[PDB]
Amino acid sequence: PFLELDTNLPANRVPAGLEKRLCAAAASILGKPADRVNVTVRPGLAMALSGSTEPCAQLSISSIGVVGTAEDNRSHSAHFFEFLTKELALGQDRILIRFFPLESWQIGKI
Amino acid sequence: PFLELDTNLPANRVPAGLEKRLCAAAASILGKPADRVNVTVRPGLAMALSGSTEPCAQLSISSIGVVGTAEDNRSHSAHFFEFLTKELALGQDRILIRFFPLESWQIGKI
Amino acid sequence: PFLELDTNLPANRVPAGLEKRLCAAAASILGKPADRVNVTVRPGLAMALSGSTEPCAQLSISSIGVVGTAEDNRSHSAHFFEFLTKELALGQDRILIRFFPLESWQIGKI
Numbered sequence: 001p002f003l004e005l006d007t008n009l010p011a012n013r014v015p016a017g018l019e020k021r022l023c024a025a026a027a028s029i030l031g032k033p034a035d036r037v038n039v040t041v042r043p044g045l046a047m048a049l050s051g052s053t054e055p056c057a058q059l060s061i062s063s064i065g066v067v068g069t070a071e072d073n074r075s076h077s078a079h080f081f082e083f084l085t086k087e088l089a090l091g092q093d094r095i096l097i098r099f100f101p102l103e104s105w106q107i108g109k110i
Numbered sequence: 111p112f113l114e115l116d117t118n119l120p121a122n123r124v125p126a127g128l129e130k131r132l133c134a135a136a137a138s139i140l141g142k143p144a145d146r147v148n149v150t151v152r153p154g155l156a157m158a159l160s161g162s163t164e165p166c167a168q169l170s171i172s173s174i175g176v177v178g179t180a181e182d183n184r185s186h187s188a189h190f191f192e193f194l195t196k197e198l199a200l201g202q203d204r205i206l207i208r209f210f211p212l213e214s215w216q217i218g219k220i
Numbered sequence: 221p222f223l224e225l226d227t228n229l230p231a232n233r234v235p236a237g238l239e240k241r242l243c244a245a246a247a248s249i250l251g252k253p254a255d256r257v258n259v260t261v262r263p264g265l266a267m268a269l270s271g272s273t274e275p276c277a278q279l280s281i282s283s284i285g286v287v288g289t290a291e292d293n294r295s296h297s298a299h300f301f302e303f304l305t306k307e308l309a310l311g312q313d314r315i316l317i318r319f320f321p322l323e324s325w326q327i328g329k330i
Contacts, residue, residue, distance in 0.1 A: 002278070002318070004226075006114075006150050011264075019266040020273055027271070034271035038316065040226045040278060041266040044121075046129040046151040051137070051144035053130055058112070058150060059218075062318075070215045077218030096148065097218030098112070098172075105290045108279075108297030108317030116224075116260045154231075156239040156261040161247070161254035163240055168222070168260060169328075180325045187328030206258065207328030208222070208282075 001030050001063035002102075003039045007088065008047035009055055015087055022083065029079040030065060049094060056094040057084055066101040073099050111140050111173035112212075113149045117198065118157035119165055125197055132193065139189040140175060159204060166204040167194055176211040183209050221250050221283035222322075223259045227308065228267035229275055235307055242303065249299040250285060269314060276314040277304055286321040293319050 003026055007014065015021075019039045027034035049056035059080055066073065077097050084095050113136055117124065125131075129149045137144035159166035169190055176183065187207050194205050223246055227234065235241075239259045247254035269276035279300055286293065297317050304315050 006152075011266075014266070019268045023268040023271055037268065037271055038278065039266075039268040042152065042226075042262065043266070046121075046124070046149075046153070048129045048133040048147065048149040051133055051147055058148065068213070068215055073215070073218060080218070081220070092220060098212070099216050099218065102318070103288070105288055105293070106319050108293060108300070108319065110301070110312060116262075152262065156231075156234070156259075156263070158239045158243040158257065158259040161243055161257055168258065178323070178325055183325070183328060190328070191330070202330060208322070209326050209328065 001026060001032055001037055001061060001065065004060040005039070005041045005057055006045055006047065007041070007043050007057040008045050008053065009043055009088060011043040014041065014043045018087055021087065025083045029076055030063065032065070049096060054094060055088070055090060057088055057090060059084065059095065059097045060100060061097065062100040062102050064102050064104060066099050068101065111136060111142055111147055111171060111175065114170040115149070115151045115167055116155055116157065117151070117153050117167040118155050118163065119153055119198060121153040124151065124153045128197055131197065135193045139186055140173065142175070159206060164204060165198070165200060167198055167200060169194065169205065169207045170210060171207065172210040172212050174212050174214060176209050178211065221246060221252055221257055221281060221285065224280040225259070225261045225277055226265055226267065227261070227263050227277040228265050228273065229263055229308060231263040234261065234263045238307055241307065245303045249296055250283065252285070269316060274314060275308070275310060277308055277310060279304065279315065279317045280320060281317065282320040282322050284322050284324060286319050288321065
C-alpha cells in the first residue's frame with residue numbers, strides 16, 4: 001500500500017518518526033507485510049480542511065487491496081482516524097481519508 | 111472537493127492566506143459549500159512545467175462533482191486560471207489543471 | 221506527461237537542477253516533446269519505502285500515453301530506475317514507480 005499524509009503542522013511539531021509508526025500501524029490495520037507498506041509525510045503545508053485552517057491532515061491510501069464500497073474500508077478508516085488523532089492531537093473533524101484502487105500493472109519495481 | 115496546488119514559488123513569495131482565498135474561490139466557482147472544500151498548497155518545490163523552470167503552478171481538483179467532458183469543466187478551469195494568474199502573478203501558460211472524479215465510497219470521514 | 225517525485229533526501233542533498241534533467245530524460249524515455257513534460261520534485265519529506273526509512277524516492281507518471289499492461293510500461297520503468305539510481309545514489313530497491321492513465325478532458329489549459 002501507498003500512504004500519503006499532508007499536514008499544515010510544521011515539520012518540527014510532527015512527532016519524530018511518525019512515518020515509521022504509521023508504516024507499522026498501516027501494516028497491522030491493512031493486514032499487509034510491512035515490507036510492502038510505503039508512507040510519505042509532507043508537513044508544513046498551507047491547508048484548509050472543511051473550509052478551515054485549524055491544524056488538519058489529509059491521508060491518501062492507494063492499494064491493490066482497495067474494494068469500491070464504504071463498508072469494505074470503514075474499519076480501516078476508523079483505525080487510521082484513531083492513529084492520527086492520537087499522534088497529531090487532531091479532532092476527528094480535522095482528518096479526511098481518500099482511498100484509491102490500484103492494479104498490479106501500475107507499480108514499477110526492480 | 112479536494113484542491114492540491116504545487117508551486118516552485120518559495121513559501122515566503124506565496125501570498126499570505128492563499129489557501130483561505132482559494133478555498134472561498136473554489137466554493138463559489140464549483141457551487142459547493144465552503145465546509146466541503148479542502149485546499150492543500152505545497153510551495154518551494156522544484157518544478158518544470160511545459161519543459162521550463164520559470165515560476166509555475168499545478169492544480170489538481172478532485173470531486174464527486176467531476177463530469178468526464180472538457181465542456182463540463184471548461185468554465186471552472188477558466189475561473190481557476192483567473193484566480194491563480196492574479197494571486198501568483200503567473201502567465202496563463204505557467205498553470206495546468208488536472209480534474210479527477212471521485213465516488214463517495216472513496217472518502218473516509220468521522 | 222506529469223511526473224511527481226517525492227524523496228526523503230533533504231533539498232540541499234538533491235542534485236541542483238534534477239527537475240530539468242528529469243524533464244529532458246522523461247521526454248526522451250516517453251517519446252514526448254519536452255514542451256509537454258511536467259516534473260515536480262518534493263524533497264525533505266519523511267518517508268518509509270518497503271517498510272524502511274533509508275533514503276528513497278517515489279515517482280508517479282501520469283499521461284494520456286499510459287497503456288494498462290506492465291509490458292507496455294516495463295521499458296519506461298527500467299529507464300526511470302536507471303535515471304534515479306544514478307542521480308540520487310539510490311539502490312533499485314529504494315525506488316518505486318506508479319503509472320496513472322489520464323484522458324484529455326482531465327487537463328485544463330489556457
